[PDB]
Design a protein around this ligand. Structure first.
Ligand SMILES: Nc1cc(Cl)ccc1NC(=O)Nc1cccc(S(=O)(=O)Oc2ccc(C(=O)O)cc2)c1
Ligand SMILES: C[S@@+](CC[C@H](N)C(=O)[O-])C[C@H]1O[C@@H](n2cnc3c(N)ncnc32)[C@H](O)[C@@H]1O
Length: 256
């Protein structure tokens, strides 16, 4: 039994009150007040459509993934990653695909900086899509489940799906459940072939063990995974720590 599975058993035993006080204990988060207010009024400039823009921003500002040329965004949802990449000088095109329909977010049309190079397509299940030529591959897919064996199936399927889209290019791929032993085996094989490293984003809630496989970095995957399991287990041991609250991202306005 991995440390991650122990964390999961404990997470599953929490009452709703304890879960709500655990999920943001000691994390970092952006203040969405202004953007939620503006988005409700129908404003299409400056605002990120979701928390996702700031989440990808954290990786890019640390050079973990460096978007360039044709950017593919798998599971773009509302489009937070796509609108963030559209404003980057090395980016020439952004194509986002997302499922849509019941239970799934729809792309939000915006006019933030670089909107003219973005095309978000809904009604697109990525597990039925042929790979496309691209220079940057982004994937934020992985639905949480109380069952780590369900999450393990979901993680492996994403990892197997993205591989054909990785053609010596930049990448940032969400790994829903990186602690399950068969997931570790797949990641290690993928790291040998494609390089990169698994990283824990500070903006991720304690209610998920998600890590991101990024193209620019190196390291021991098992060791970084167990470090997160230990951190997440330690956050059950003390009274809620209020999160670090940061300014949300300003994505500007206008064409590129
Ligand atoms: N596209 C669409 C087309 C049609 Cl015909 C009908 C509905 C939609 N739209 C969605 O079903 N949106 C949607 C987007 C994200 C999640 C979910 S959800 O998981 O189903 O339900 C939640 C989850 C959490 C919360 C909350 O407040 O925390 C609220 C609702 C739905
Ligand atoms: C975490 S959200 C993406 C958040 C986004 N990166 C942002 O910044 O706004 C993951 C998205 O993947 C979508 N998704 C899940 N399964 C999918 C599939 N099979 N094909 C395409 N999109 C899928 C979900 O509907 C959801 O919107």
């Amino acid at each position: 039994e991995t440390l991650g599975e122990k964390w999961k058993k404990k997470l599953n035993q929490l009452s709703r009150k304890e879960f709500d006080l655990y999920k943001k204990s000691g994390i970092t988060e952006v203040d969405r007040t202004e953007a939620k207010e503006g988005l409700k009024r129908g404003e299409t400039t400056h605002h990120a459509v979701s928390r996702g823009s700031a989440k990808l921003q954290w990786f890019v500002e640390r050079n973990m993934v460096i978007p360039e040329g044709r950017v593919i965004d798998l599971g773009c949802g509302r489009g937070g990653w796509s609108y963030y990449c559209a404003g980057l000088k090395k980016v020439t095109e952004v194509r986002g695909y997302t499922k849509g329909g019941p239970g799934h977010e729809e792309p939000v049309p915006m006019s933030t900086y670089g909107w003219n190079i973005v095309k978000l397509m809904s009604g697109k299940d990525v597990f039925y899509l042929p790979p496309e030529k691209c220079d940057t591959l982004l994937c934020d897919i992985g639905e949480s489940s109380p069952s780590p064996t369900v999450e393990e199936s979901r993680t492996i399927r994403v990892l197997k799906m993205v591989e054909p889209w990785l053609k010596n290019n930049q990448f940032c791929i969400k790994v829903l459940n990186p602690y399950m032993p068969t997931v570790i085996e797949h990641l290690e094989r993928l790291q040998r072939k494609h390089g990169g490293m698994l990283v824990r984003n500070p903006l991720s809630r304690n209610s998920t063990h998600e890590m991101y496989w990024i193209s620019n970095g190196t390291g021991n995957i098992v060791s970084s995974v167990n470090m997160v399991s230990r951190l997440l287990l330690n956050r059950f041991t003390m009274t809620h720590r209020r999160p670090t609250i940061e300014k949300d991202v300003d994505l500007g306005a206008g064409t590129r």
